[PDB]
């Protein structure tokens, strides 16, 4: 028979619903099993699934160069060929012969799909940016003090709107409750008049940006791109431990990617992991403190998978290639290599990748953003008001203080 | 005498009110039942009423190559004839022989009816969640009683900020109709400036979530086709066990039916139905999470049944007809179909029809009913203001006629109002310590898949109770929560042990306000820092409950997981926790009385 | 040969772009011209696609019983096989045989697709029902009734709330405009108390509301049923003058079918068309004011084509069938039946109906609807609130008339 | 010699800046002329540098199976090698041969960038119409001085409602900072109160059109991928006319793939371009609603050249590589494989690289200034606000000023205002009927497929120009109209005549006002009735030009067809429609100021 090495991983290698039933070549679902099958149809040989006995993709120890996984065993004889997810490097490309990329690919990011956080103490004041809201204490302030200069001016006895009123009438124009006192001036009405003309549209933008907000979310990514990651430690990420990917940031010649490397070894609780399925389950039990670089291809399956707690960020960080793994002048080298050019022309391979990554695609990108809900505020989001509500009361207790004392001193 | 066989679907063959009263062809009743003595008047023959023994029509399977149910005693020979609600299908062409279409269908789509709007008296409360509205509530009795602390206190005369014109102040300044009083002490603009960009931000906070509840509500996509069905996931889509429904869906080939057809394959669980009562019954109890995909002359019957709460949602997706079987080759199958031509020529198939499905009709009228389209408020929708309003009208008609008769009694002391304002804060000592004491704040259960857990949480110890007896197993709450928002929570612990000790201050100041206590002289200003004591007390420990929820809220969601309760309900001693702070404030502004005369 | 008359209907007949060029078999596309190679393959004939000569579908004069159209060609020899969109009725039963039904389908309607309206004169109080508006009124004068009951008891000299002030506090309360005057009683402030926060709502529920129906529009329909044509002759509706769907109106048994056709021929401007292509620029040329009766089928694939200015609605009125009209006592009856039989056994017409509805399909509903604009307020959506401003303002100046002559007279 | 044969492609070969002064190899520049010299210099062969005819890379067509382009030079002979950005594909592969591919890429897509937010000075004036918002200001000048009118009148002493005072209370009732002074009379409570229902409608319109815009302003959608360029036909998609990039999407089989490919197929017009530039020069003015799916790498280098507005969105849809290429079964071309492989150990590969993407950049850090997520306001979003508040300070500074010299200059007529009063009402009279005389209310173009026909219409006559000359062929506007609109223009067209004739009895009965005319005993009452019908003149007339604008506006929409214009702007003599409404009152509050001394 062909020793045909599969690494067990979905959706290339899936186990049946009755595994322990079935044997061999009926228990293995998924790509690679239609591509072992659709590889010796047109080649003619008796093509045996087994999973690596090691368990990993292949890499060699720097030092003893000893490969293991399933590189290992097609240079040392035990497994005839490798139909399977593996990456054409350079060191792969000298101990065996590869195919032609029947699958084109790249290494992305997936991180803990973010949910809504708590809310800030002071998102109150989000619908209206820091540089409105300085420049409206800025033209409250200098707004009151025009009406001051105007009053003194024009005595038309005593002067009411003094700068200890003139703040006021701006205060209760500002806050939607109008003040017993009036200007009696042309010269003051028209301050009067284009003040109340300022708030009139900025309550009314303050009431529609915060109806756009509870309306349209939009949960953003914390991180989005290689840069996002080595400039801030907080959120770990790492790779397999024994995968091309973990071989391309230690040969990398990109600086950015040379920091990642030097950050992947060094702060250690254990960042590395056995298993694709490890690192989908230490993204998801992180609560956002992991982020598993992995590739595409196998991201665009997690992400259309139950129960779609992942999304991709960023793209694709290089491009890659999949081939089918040959020993060093294997027999099977020839029609193989002809076998993925004759599948690749009838666009076989095509119409088995739009089949498979959709027909299970059950969590369309639709059903977590078509199903919007109905909240009501809860109390994280006002609690600043709140706060500062109890932040201006105690202040009031202190002036109460100073400026009855001050009243006795005098 | 000719073997009759059917299955029990009402509209069509429906047992009888009293089945062990009655005997024969007197056990069952429906549509097809008057259908088969008509059959026998025209054709001549007894005919020997039989159910199949399965409860299913069915079909051929993979394996075995077989028909069950109804089919296979019409392709063996169990039974001589079918009369039946049985759907002439190609597949079921070949095996045995059909009449001509005697009732046209086509498989429609029912789901539950969108349910009747019930707003309740209090869905003008909807945006903002009882939390705040509470936390209005006590704020407004807060800045209140504080403007009231500052007018007495500061000589900025008369007053004219009184307890009853500052609560009528800051209900001025809440509903943004102001007032004419005017605060002009700098320390009482501060109080009311602040109180302003309070109602400022909740008002808008209302108007804002109010209509984005609104715009949601429009954009609810009330779908009625079965492309729309195919593009949504969030209801199941399920038919009988073995029908002509789901060997439709399987040798369909167009790409909306195939793509409902792998959504019907990967089903978990399995989303298929043994018979269409249970699969009717399903829907009544998802709630329009779940679709039922049956023919359309089920679905008109049992739409106008009681609770009438399942509705047609588009048309037919196909075009099919019922036939009476007989096996392949009887001879008494063209008497059949001439019997069939011949009640179709009289009319009298449609005289079953109109007949049956209108006197049996139990609601009826919802085209008529649904002639309305809802778009704006309903009077409903606002309701429970418009019940305020009448009721606080009457509320107010009952204070005018007490204050009259207050009048009119006052036309037929300061020791007794310092004996009320200790006694409030012995109650309000009494009232805070027991929240910090007890840790039965939040009342919730919770569960594993079907074992749930009641327990009571604080900020101590979350105390869950064990079950199998009493439990009580108590574990620390501080260390429990995360621990970026663990900070608050020591603030607020902190917070609630000041609230403790600075009303502690309090009380002890309202003890030297008493007529036996330290003296007459210079006891005012005593009774001065006390009142200031009071009011710091009640707003620091207001904080130390706004920490405490808030960060609640964040572990009932964000927190340790195998264990999430259903319920954060807040228990009693939290009531008594706010209760702590009326009281507060309400011993606060007997001081301030007795101080101001 | 096997002359194959086919009626020139899209999608089922199309002319080719250059279609003076070619001719016969490859001058014709459609779905008909689909059907027609797919049976005389599987059967052995020359088929030569005719267009009918006459032009018409088919239909008897009830007095001089001739057939006209696709039907009296068969009938009278000149044609061999109708592979075509013709519907098998009773009356066609008794002169010629037909194939099972290869397409399902039912009798539609076609209205112009209901844009915008100009807006109603009184439709700024839309987001309020007048269930509401009537309740707030007998509200405002209610709440105004109590409040003066209060102020004439408690006289804590003179009672400042009169009737004639009473209204005109109510008013300040719910127009947002505090007035000046207060209630100095328990018994009247617990009534301003309720009554300010009656208007707190009702201008929240007001601004809400209003912002639900300028973000999402739905663009109502005014007839959605058979019931909805029958009871209102404002919108004219019609069929083909020569056609199974005019020949199902005068045979109905059903009263409001019956209702329908006996509008149809008594008031005549010409509601009947010649063709199904004159029956659509009939619809897009009225301005809402015809709705073309004819097939599901029919009407599909003009939802689905440009400009897409039509839509369906309701649903069938009944079921029919699409058959392959052969003459009786033909030759190819039997093996047209069985290939009618054959290529839907393997879901040939399936696969056909699932391309060529969908594949020319480029305005799918998505491309309607989310096209949503941004569009400010016309002056015709508040045009009403002016209409009242200067009702309210000369109702002013008769008041100021007659108040001022009747001091004149006392 | 060998022959070299590349296309102007920028940034790979480009043109000299003076391609008629330099010669031979002098005459192109670029990436790839950079790559040959070094290829020349490790084989040691003389290069002779080509460009094709054709101007496209081109591959094999159907009917005539032959490669055209650069390909049809490699595959015949025409050229001896070819160093140019061409795509290693297997159709390209069974015809010529290739080397190791030396530049990775992939099928990018271009958008044009989103475009620089920009809200203009007057930005919160977008959910009102300009309309509207002069219907207000005239509006406002309308309820006052009936306010005005109504004071002066009544009984109801003193009168705190001057026309000062006035203009103030109904600012203070527009803006809902109320004002002190009540109206006491029941005629001063209705035109109150009506204008309180005025305002409490229009701002709330004006919050809810704002929070429509906001709310559509986030559902934008900014699409990333090409899974949802699929899902929109609103922006269209094209390729070279004939490339890698096209091929590509022809032998695709994914069904997003080829659900664009079918997009691609049925064109109106053609979407495929003839060249890049020329592709790219459709995304610059197409605004967005454009897409030139193109390669990756001519995506990076495109973005980082003015006016660096075209955004690379999503990541590569494929992964390809350049290859140089030479004929099937040369010679040469597996020393070019070894010199490709030589500069890659070298590195001088990426050594042309970082010297040339970087040092030709002229805008570049797209992902620097893009840190920021816009989501709330800017302060350029209601700038022109803060630009009226320090504007409107300035203005009222020198009001102060002015005012003050009015003061020291006082420290230092009614027959005037009889003659000011009759010589508004004469212009207002002459500012009317000018209105109702001339046909040029509204200036706009309308256009036949490209031919613009310039017109002006009014009430009466609808004159088009007509080109070729003057034109000025009239038809009557009030049949134009569509007929259950026409009725409300019928209204106007009376109002308006109305408007005139009760003007008429205005200053004519201003007249009488003279002191040489009628009387002074009994005139007072004169000019009473004088100016009560100013104020009914202009109240009616302003209902006039609501109900033409309103109408006008349906007419440009919903009309007869073979005429539509572009613009429906208001032109002249509609100013003076409401120059004359200005000066009915403007005459009328001279002559209430007449009255009441
Ligand atoms: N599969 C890749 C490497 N790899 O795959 C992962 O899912 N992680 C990871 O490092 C290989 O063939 O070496
Ligand atoms: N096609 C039908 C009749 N018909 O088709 C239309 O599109 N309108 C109409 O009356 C037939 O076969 O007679």
Chains 1, 3 share one sequence.
């Not at 009755?18 to 590889?39: F, P, Q, S």
């Not at 990993?56 to 490969?67: E, F, L, N, P």
């Not at 989908?280 to 707690?309: F, H, W």
Request: net charge positive.
């Amino acid at each position: 028979t062909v020793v045909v090495t599969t690494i067990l991983e979905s959706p290339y290698v899936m186990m049946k619903k009755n595994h322990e039933m079935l044997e061999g070549n009926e228990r293995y679902e998924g790509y690679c099993v239609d591509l072992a099958a659709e590889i010796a149809k047109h080649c003619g040989f008796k093509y045996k699934l087994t999973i690596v006995g090691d368990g990993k993709y292949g890499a060699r120890d720097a030092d003893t160069k000893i490969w293991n996984g399933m590189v290992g065993e097609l240079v040392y004889g035990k497994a005839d060929i490798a139909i399977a997810p593996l990456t054409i490097t350079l060191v792969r490309e000298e101990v065996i012969d590869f195919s032609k990329p029947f699958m084109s690919l790249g290494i992305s990011i997936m991180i803990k799909k973010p949910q809504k956080s708590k809310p800030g103490v002071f998102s109150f004041l989000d619908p209206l940016a820091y540089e409105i809201w300085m420049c409206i204490v800025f033209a409250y302030i200098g707004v009151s003090v025009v009406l001051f200069l105007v009053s003194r001016f024009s005595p038309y006895s005593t002067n009411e709107f003094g700068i200890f009123n003139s703040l006021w009438f701006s205060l209760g124009a500002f806050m939607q409750q109008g003040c017993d006192i009036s200007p009696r001036s042309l010269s003051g009405r028209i301050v009067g008049g284009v003040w109340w003309f300022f708030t009139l549209i900025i309550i009314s933008s303050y009431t529609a940006n915060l109806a756009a907000f509870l309306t349209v979310e939009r949960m953003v990514s914390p991180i989005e791109s290689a840069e996002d990651l080595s400039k801030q430690t907080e959120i770990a990420y790492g790779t397999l431990d024994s995968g091309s990917t973990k071989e391309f940031f230690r040969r990398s010649k990109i600086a950015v990617f040379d920091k990642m490397w030097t950050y992947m070894r060094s702060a250690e609780p254990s960042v590395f992991v056995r298993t694709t399925a490890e690192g989908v389950a230490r993204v998801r039990k992180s609560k956002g403190k992991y982020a598993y670089l992995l590739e595409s291809t196998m991201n665009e399956y997690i992400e259309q998978r139950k129960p779609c707690d992942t999304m991709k960020v960023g793209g694709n960080l290089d491009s890659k290639g999949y081939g089918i793994a040959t020993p060093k002048g294997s027999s099977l080298g020839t029609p193989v290599n002809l076998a993925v050019l004759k599948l690749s022309e009838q666009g076989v391979l095509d119409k088995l990748k739009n089949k498979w990554w959709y027909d299970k695609g059950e969590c369309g990108a639709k059903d977590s953003g078509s199903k919007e809900k109905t909240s009501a505020l809860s109390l994280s989001n006002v609690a600043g008001v709140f706060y500062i509500l109890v932040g201006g009361l105690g202040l009031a207790m202190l002036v109460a203080l100073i400026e009855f004392c001050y009243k006795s001193r005098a």
